[PDB]
Amino acid sequence: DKRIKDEEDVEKELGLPVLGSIQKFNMTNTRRSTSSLIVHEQPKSPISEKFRGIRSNIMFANPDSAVQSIVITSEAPGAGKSTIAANLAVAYAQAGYKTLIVDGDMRKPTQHYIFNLPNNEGLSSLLLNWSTYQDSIISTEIEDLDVLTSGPIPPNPSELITSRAFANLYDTLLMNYNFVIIDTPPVNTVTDAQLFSKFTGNVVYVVNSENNNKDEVKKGKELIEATGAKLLGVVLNRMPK
Ligand SMILES: Nc1ncnc2c1ncn2[C@@H]1O[C@H](COP(=O)(O)OP(=O)(O)O)[C@@H](O)[C@H]1O
Ligand SMILES: [Mg+2]
């Protein structure tokens, strides 16, 4: 019934460009990757090429665009925000950008799972001054890729995002990294992604082609655009091919 299913649907129903399309993972398109971090584990796979194309699009499709950071978000849970964010981050690092991925989903974080990292310190603890900057950001075994995990689950993420601590951190991150990617919770349920979007001014919108309602997806788009941020485009995920 009501799915945004493909590129035509994105153009016609949402009026956005498609930055890339990510197929549902299989043995062939991931070359039997052991994890969902395809770009790292199988850098020559078809899927890995798609993420490189997304990277090239963001950085080179628009002449004298100067994108320093992006929010990765979606309308609903399970769209593939975390997976797209992590793989895109690796793609940036491989290309030689000093890259940070920030786990800004302080409600249901998964970047520590994806990158196999401890989550005792991270974004929440840093913002609460429980941990230091240098202790909270992890340099991964992937060269040019750092990760700021979510940290412990805080009582009120909104309070942290709107704190002067975060505004000041964000400024510091822009000065320390060539590219910053912020993973977020879904738009329709909490305003976290909208708040982060006010900072980055640039948003990549992930749409699960397998399972979505067009009215819900459209509502999320409108909420993002209402922040004043530029919605760069859509990444279609779980595509049949
Ligand atoms: N293209 C894909 N093919 C198969 N599985 C995927 C794909 N994208 C994401 N997933 C899986 O779907 C689940 C939800 O993805 P996740 O990135 O956590 O979504 P979100 O952050 O939007 O909730 C994860 O287990 C992830 O490995
Ligand atoms: Mg997630």
Numbering used by the authors: 197 to 222, 1001 to 1215
Per the authors:
The structure of the S. aureus CapAB chimeric protein was determined at 1.8 Å resolution. The refined structure of the CapAB chimeric protein includes a continuous polypeptide corresponding to residues 197a to 222a of Cap5A1 linked to residues 1b to 215b of Cap5B2. The asymmetric unit contains two molecules with a small contact surface area of about 600 Å2, characteristic of packing interactions. The crystal form of the truncated cytoplasmic domain of CapAB is thus a monomer, as observed in solution by size-exclusion chromatography (unpublished data). The CapACt fragment (residues 194a–222a) provides an additional strand called βA (residues 214a–219a) interacting with strand β7 of CapB and thus completing the central β-sheet of the protein. CapACt also contains an additional α-helix called αA (residues 202a–211a) interacting with helix α10 (residues 187b–200b) of CapB. The total surface contact area between CapACt and CapB covers about 3,000 Å2 and is highly hydrophobic, explaining why CapB is poorly soluble in the absence of CapACt (unpublished data). The active site of the protein contains ADP-Mg, most probably resulting from the hydrolysis of the 10 mM ATP-Mg contained in the crystallization solution. The adenine ring is also involved in a classical hydrophobic sandwich interaction with the side chains of CapB R212b and CapA F221a. Thus, the crystallized protein was heterogeneously phosphorylated, and the absence of electron density corresponding to the C-terminal extremity suggests that the phosphorylated tyrosine cluster is highly flexible.
We describe here the first crystal structure of a bacterial tyrosine kinase, namely CapB from the pathogen Staphylococcus aureus, in complex with the cytoplasmic domain of the transmembrane stimulatory protein CapA. CapA and CapB, among others, are involved as copolymerases in the synthesis of extracellular polysaccharides that are thought to be potent virulence factors. Reproducing the Gram-negative organization of BY-kinases by direct linkage of the Cap5A1Ct fragment (herein called CapACt) to the N-terminal extremity of Cap5B2 (herein called CapB) allowed the production of a fully active soluble protein called CapAB. The CapB kinase core possesses a P-loop type α/β mononucleotide binding fold.
